[PDB]
Subunit: 363 residues, 3 copies
């Protein structure tokens, strides 16, 4: 039976630490610099407490429901509090315990993205109700569909590190919420921490320290850099001069945009995707909930452009056998639509259930 | 003869970097946000300078006296400035040089915990005298007894990553000192950095990237999360609402509390220990020297509960052969008592020697 | 043919992340705390945007020109946008893609050092012109000469991690620029981040997680610590008392000073070099462009003292066969002189070309 590679265990434990770093303190510092000063302490408390909450649900049933074998949409409850996972159980080339932690860290940042923005406007008890509903009925199933052999995986969807599961998912939940900057040095710092953490998010998504981790790494560096220049250029062109928030936003645009693609494309495609994401990001925000705007627009762009740049002819690792580019594009579009709709319905339901129970707006 | 595993070398060099990160800037930023503004620069200077000092003593004689073979209480002086350690010498499954650095990083954070709190009130020259006395006569011997095959090890004490050597040790030295918040975003940031660094502290304590590192990792995530919720819940129950400092304190409570236990217990036990530590932490502080209160109370709780949750029947890795739970508990209690008393006497002696030499209170 | 070691791939991807961390946000936070408050946002924007720029040039032609095989001074254009690098191509014991990223991260921090200081005083378009000229005509060739088998390598120059390529190179470019503190907690934080990142910079320079990485690690800890004490002592002796900025500056002095030496010397030599660098650093600044003063003086000192402490007799790894200490010293001095002069001429040319094109001073 399959044995764990200690190089892969080491790499993926470090990568997990780096993705946890994106939430505590990365996204908290990012939002903390954007939202109103009088609301900062409260937002940091909600982000910390709901981080804790997601860690606990994850171990309790969340991992089992996302990565256990179930149906197209849901796993199982065989792995309650990780029961029936032998300590020496291997998954891929690493101990399954490490897989549990790595996967849970992506749940954390996804919820962090939502809670940092709406903490300002949502009653504390209502944010907790929301997180439970939405993590369970939206993050878990969509993680299952994409990474847990569910519906979208079984149709060949390409999403290396979570254009759909993290970015579009959170953008939508966040925008349904929206519907219902005071310290820029602090914003830069959280962007920097998000950037560094994002190497574990992207490279670690290979599940091993191989050439695919290596390619995801370099593509992360290249797409972020290109998106920064693309945003800044567009800001200089429209606004006369670059801005710090413009630079940071560009960095996030390329990161988001390269997320579904990093392990599939060539550096040339990483560059193109970075430029397009930076401009699309800028275009989008022109039309702190802007954050969901960048994530949504840039994650859509990234997801689509994965179905293009994965092609061998464009420097990519190649589509699966018998899969033309037109097919892959169709599948990317279907994954994106399912994610938008599934997350929105569940977001809507989470917000309504909170509102009926405790009320939504902060008193 | 034993050969180094490059996966283990890589893992443990990264883990060391992460534990150094807990001090520079983690604990400095933590205290910097708590202590009075007019005292911050001075505290950061003392924490930086005494960090340097501990790094130097460690290489000079400290490593040799803690990890050389000696008696029950002290090692030797065979390893002055690491003499007689061949560059290719292996210890466990890593080069001994890496062991030297990893172990020294735990000395650093231990002293950081003490100096950040009392820098406010202690003359600079007096803090330096103190660090030399206490590192040498308390941290070194207790490290030797627990991790260097001394007294407590030879009786089977369980302390995976330093409930006794770091937490209770520093709590006591700190409280003997005490006897003789202005920027909460900064407090959150150092808590976040302590949390991330704490994965190298806990996982790296396996000495290898194996299933025990993996288990220590997951248990770290789970106990911190549970302690956060446990503290916050108790604060909501007693104070009407959660607070940011409450959340951060809870995070530290679970971290401390899971420290002696992380590599020995199951996630179920990690959860229980996290909840208890969060509440005990809150209970303790109710009765910035609060920091030593959490470390002391939570490290005592963690140390005791290791002697319980290590049991195979409760999901743990199992006690040694022929060791009943009652026995392990007795040994945990004896280790805790020896640490409290040994550290206190030496703390007291360090403070008195400083006071007689240069005087203790800042002029 | 040579196969990649996954332990080395993991180690070096993490090390790269750590060196990128030194720039984003390390050096930005360092300068941000030093320069005038009204200039901070602008400096952070320029550091972020030129970081992006260096990442892009690097992938486009920069890597190929530095590490392709060419002549004594320049590589080639065989590796445009990494063309002709097979994804599974190995270099040393890691995938070449990882080598590309690791090497590019050193270009980034080098430019970060220059731009953080002069952003205050240089027109944005002029800093971009400058970076292109200087990275291409100075950083690339000097990287080629030292690490890409060019002139200085072929004569046996010792520079483990970039006393010449990074520190002296940037000091000079920076001082030619100069010729033509408001938040100390923020300065400490960036110093801390530079320190932690510097373990990937120094240890990762072994190209593998072996005993040399291990030695570079420990030597980093020891030289930084010793330089901190050496600076602080000199400040106490001259100024009556230590200061936070004094402590941070000392830390940077030892780091810079041990950079060319870390993988070649013994811990005893690491200690000596640390003390000398801390004092020389202090001496130098006595005679935020001080930053280039420390880097220049301390990098010169470090480079020279590598040619001394590498000796087997002084605990070092040993000079190459047939190389006496006097010879190695001669070669170190020649490398230092070539770097000073090459960088200055190119710096001067970059500043003049910018000035003739867009003008240099901020309007």
């Amino acid at each position: 039976p399959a044995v764990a590679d200690k190089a892969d265990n080491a790499f993926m434990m470090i990568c997990t630490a780096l993705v946890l770093f994106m939430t505590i303190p990365g996204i908290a510092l990012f939002y903390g610099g954007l939202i109103r000063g009088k609301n900062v302490l409260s937002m940091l408390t909600q982000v910390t407490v709901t981080f804790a909450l997601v860690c606990i649900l994850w171990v309790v049933y969340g991992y089992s429901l996302a990565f256990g074998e179930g149906n197209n949409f849901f796993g199982n409850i065989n792995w309650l509090m990780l029961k029936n996972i032998e300590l020496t159980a291997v998954m891929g080339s690493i101990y399954q315990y490490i897989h549990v932690a790595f996967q849970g860290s992506f749940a954390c940042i996804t919820v962090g993205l939502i809670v940092g923005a709406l903490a300002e406007r949502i009653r504390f008890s209502a944010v907790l109700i929301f997180v439970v509903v939405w993590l369970t009925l939206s993050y878990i199933p969509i993680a299952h569909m994409v990474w847990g052999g569910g519906l979208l995986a079984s149709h060949g969807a390409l999403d290396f590190a979570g254009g759909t599961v993290v970015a579009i998912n959170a953008a939508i939940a966040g925008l349904v919420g929206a519907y219902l900057p005071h310290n820029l040095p602090m914003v830069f710092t959280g962007t920097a921490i998000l950037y560094i953490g994002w190497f574990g998010f992207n490279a670690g998504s290979a599940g091993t320290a191989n050439e695919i981790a290596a390619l995801a790494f370099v593509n992360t560096v290249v797409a972020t850099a290109a998106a920064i220049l693309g945003w800044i250029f567009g800001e200089w062109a429209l606004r006369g001069k670059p801005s710090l928030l413009g630079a940071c936003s560009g960095a996030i645009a390329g990161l988001v945009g390269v997320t579904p693609a990093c392990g599939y494309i060539g550096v040339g495609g990483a560059l193109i995707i970075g430029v397009v994401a930076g401009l699309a990001g800028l275009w989008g925000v022109t039309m702190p909930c802007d954050v969901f705007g960048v994530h949504g627009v840039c994650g859509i762009v990234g997801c689509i452009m994965t179905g293009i740049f994965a092609a061998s002819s464009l420097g990519g690792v190649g589509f699966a056998e018998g899969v033309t580019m037109g097919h892959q594009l169709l599948v990317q579009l279907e994954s994106i639509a399912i994610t938008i709709v599934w997350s929105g319905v569940v977001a809507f339901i989470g917000y309504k259930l909170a509102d009926l129970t405790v009320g939504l707006r902060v008193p």
